[model samples]
Target: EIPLKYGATNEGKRQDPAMQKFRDNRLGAFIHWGLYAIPGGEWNGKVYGGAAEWLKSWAKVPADEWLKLMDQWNPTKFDAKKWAKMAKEMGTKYVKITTKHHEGFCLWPSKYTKYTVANTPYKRDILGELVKAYNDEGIDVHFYFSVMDWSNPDYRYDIKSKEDSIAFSRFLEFTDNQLKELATRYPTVKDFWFDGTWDASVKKNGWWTAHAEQMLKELVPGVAINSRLRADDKGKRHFDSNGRLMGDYESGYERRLPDPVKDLKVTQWDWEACMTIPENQWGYHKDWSLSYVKTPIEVIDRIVHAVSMGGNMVVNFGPQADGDFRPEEKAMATAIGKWMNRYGKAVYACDYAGFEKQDWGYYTRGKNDEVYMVVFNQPYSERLIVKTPKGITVEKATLLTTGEDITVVETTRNEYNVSVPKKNPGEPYVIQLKVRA
Candidate 1:
C-alpha cells in the first residue's frame, strides 16, 4: 500500500456526541442564496436551463458585470425567524445555508473582501441572524462554502507557473482567513459543507486540504467536515488512497440518492444528500416552466428512501431576489410537513432495516429497533409480503397513524402476509411492526 502523510486523520467515522446528533437528525433544509438570485437564471432576456447558481458562467458575464448585481441586492422580506419557523414546520432538525457560493458573494459581512453584505444595500448580517434564529428554535445550523471564487483575481483553477503558485498561495490564506472568521462569528455552527474544491489547484495542494480540515476542527471543536473537501498526498478525493474516508461524513450524494437495495455500504458511514425541487436549479429561477418540478410526494419518497439507507436528505429552497420563496417551494414544504406530522417516526432517528426490499415500499428501523413499513404503493392482491431475516418473528403489527392492530398471517418461513387497511389511506402511510428475535 502506498503510504501518505496527509491521509485520513481519523481511523474511522467519528463517534462524538455532535456527530451522533447529526446522524440522529435524519432530515435537513438547504438554502442556496447568492447574487445569482437577482438574475434568476436568465441573462439578456434569454434563459439558460442549467443550474441557476451558475448563471454568470452560462451568460459569460464578466466578474465586474456580475458584481454589479450587488447594487440591486436587497432582500427586504428575508426574515430569519420566518425561515426557522418554516424549517420547524417541515420537521427538519437542522438547516444548511450558503455562506458563499462560487459567485464569490458573501451572505455574511466579511472584512476580508468588499464583495459582501457590508458593501451591499442589505447591510445586515444575514448569516448571523439566521444562525441565531434556527438555534433558538432548537435546530442545528451548518454552512455551505465554495472554495472556488470566480470573483477573486488570485483564484486559480490550476497552478502552472511560479506566478500561479504565489497567487494561489495568497488565495489559500484568504480562504483560511474567511473560514476562521466564520468559525469565530458562528461558534455554534455544526458542520462546514465544502464545495468547488475539484480544481487541480486544490487537488495538488493535498496538504492544504488536510490543513484546512485540521484548522476548522481546531477552531470549532466537534465541527463535522464533508468528504468532498479532502485530498490525500496522491491527490485522491473523498476516500484516501487506502480507501478510508478522510472527512467525518460522505457528501458524494448530491441531487441524487444511493440505491436502496444495492448501496447498503452507505449505512457503514455517515452521509447526506441534498436535492433541488426542480431539475437542476439550486438558486432562484423565475421560470420553473423550463423543466419539470418535483411534486411534494416525490420529494417525500426521496427523503424516506435516503433515511432507509442510513443517510440524511436535505431539501433545497431557493428564495426570490425579494426574499420571498416561490409558491411552489412553500407549497411543497407544507405538503411534506403535513405527511411528516403523522409519520415522522419513520424518518427522524430511523435507519436501514435488514429486510429485503419489496415492490410495495421501503423499510426503516427506528432507534428503538422497531420496524416501520412505509407503504407508497397499493398491491392488487391487497397483501403486503414481508420477509424478515431468519430467527426474527413479527410480534405485532399496527397502523402508525392510529394504534389499531392489523392482521398478520404466517405464509412461509421467515415471511408473513400483512393485510391492508379496510379503508384506503388517501396518501402514503406507515405501519409499525414489533419484532422479536
Candidate 2:
C-alpha cells in the first residue's frame, strides 16, 4: 500500500486534451501593462525599489491612497494593434495580458468596482482592443487576472471570524463576477493565467478557482489555465506531490527552464515558462537602471532554451503608462523578430530532441520526423557535431540559413558527426536534417 505522504497523489494532473493544445503552442508574449506601470514602484515623494505592481503594499498605502493614481492613468500613446504587431513579429502564437493585478487595477471596465479603466483618465477598454487586435493577427489572447483585489474594502489579509468569512466570501463573489464578465465579454480570449491567488481568502475559496477555470473553458472551447491559481498544504501549487501537473500544463519556472535530460517528462504534458527582460521588473517603472535588463541575444537564448526543453517561453513586456514601449523593449523585440524570421522553424511547434543537452550550446528540437539542431556557441574546431545514439540515421544535413550544404559522415550507430558550413552565421542558426526511422 502507498503510504500517505504530503504530495503523494498527483492531485490534479491527467492526460488532458486541453493541455495538449497548449503544448503545441511553443511561444507566447506576456504583457504586464497597467496603471501601476506609471508609478513603477513609487509612492508619495519616494520610490522604493520593490515590484512595481506591489508598490501599494510596499509603501503601506491603503486602498484609498493607492486609488489616487487612477487619475493619472492617461496612456496617450497606448495602441493595441502596435503591441499585437510586435508579438506577431516575434513569432508568438498567443499573448497574455494582465487584466488586473494585486493592486486591483482592472484593464477592462468591470461592473464590480470603479477601480478599472472606466474610472481612469484613459476610459477605454484596453483589454478588449488588445484581444481584437491580437486575434486579427492570428494570435490567441489570454487574460492574466489576479484574485487579490486591493480596491475592495472587503479584502482582508487574514481571517478572524464568520464576519470576516462573510466579507471575504463577498469579495470572492466580486472577483468571480469580474471573471465571469471577462470570460463572457471577450469570448475570443483563449485562457485565464491567474496570479495573486495566494491570499488566505483565496485558499479558503480555492474551489472557486477550479470552478472559474471550468467556466472559462466552457465559454472558450480551447482555453488554458496556469498552476498558480490552485494549491495545497505542502506548497504544491498546482499538482499534488505524487506527480500530477496542475492547470493546463506545468506553469512553474517563471524565468528558468528544466534540465534537458532530467526534465524530459515535460513532453508528456503541456508546460510553459514566462520571462522578464529586467532582473525583477514586471510593472511599469520610470527608472530602467534599477534592475539588470536583458539584451536581444540573451532573450533569443532563453526562447531557444524553453523549446529545447519541450516548453513555451513567454517573454514579458511592460509598457510605459503612456502606452508606449521603452526604447530597450522595442530593440529587444526587433532583435527577436530578426532571429525568428530566420530560424523560427527550429522552434514553433517543435518537440524536444531525445538527446541530452551538450556543452556546445546548441539545443535540439524536432518536428515530424525531422530534427533541428540550434547552434549558439560552436566548438573551437569550427566543425559542428551531431551524435545520434543507437536508433536513428542522419540522411542529410544543411544550414537553415543560405541553404548551404554541410558535409555529413557516419562514424557508427554509437557515433555521428555533421559538418558546419565554412561560413558560419554570426548569430544563432539552425541546421535541419531528416532522421531516418
* Alpha-carbon local distance difference test for all models: 0.92, 0.77
TM-scores, one per candidate: 0.98, 0.92
Model 2: lowest-lDDT 10 consecutive positions: 1-10
Q: How much is the lDDT of residue 360 in candidate 2?
A: 55
Cα lDDT of model 2 by residue, 329-385, tens digit: 888888888888899888877777777576555555565756787887877776666
Among the numbered candidates, top lDDT falls to: 1
Q: Among these predicted structures, which one has the highest TM-score?
A: 1
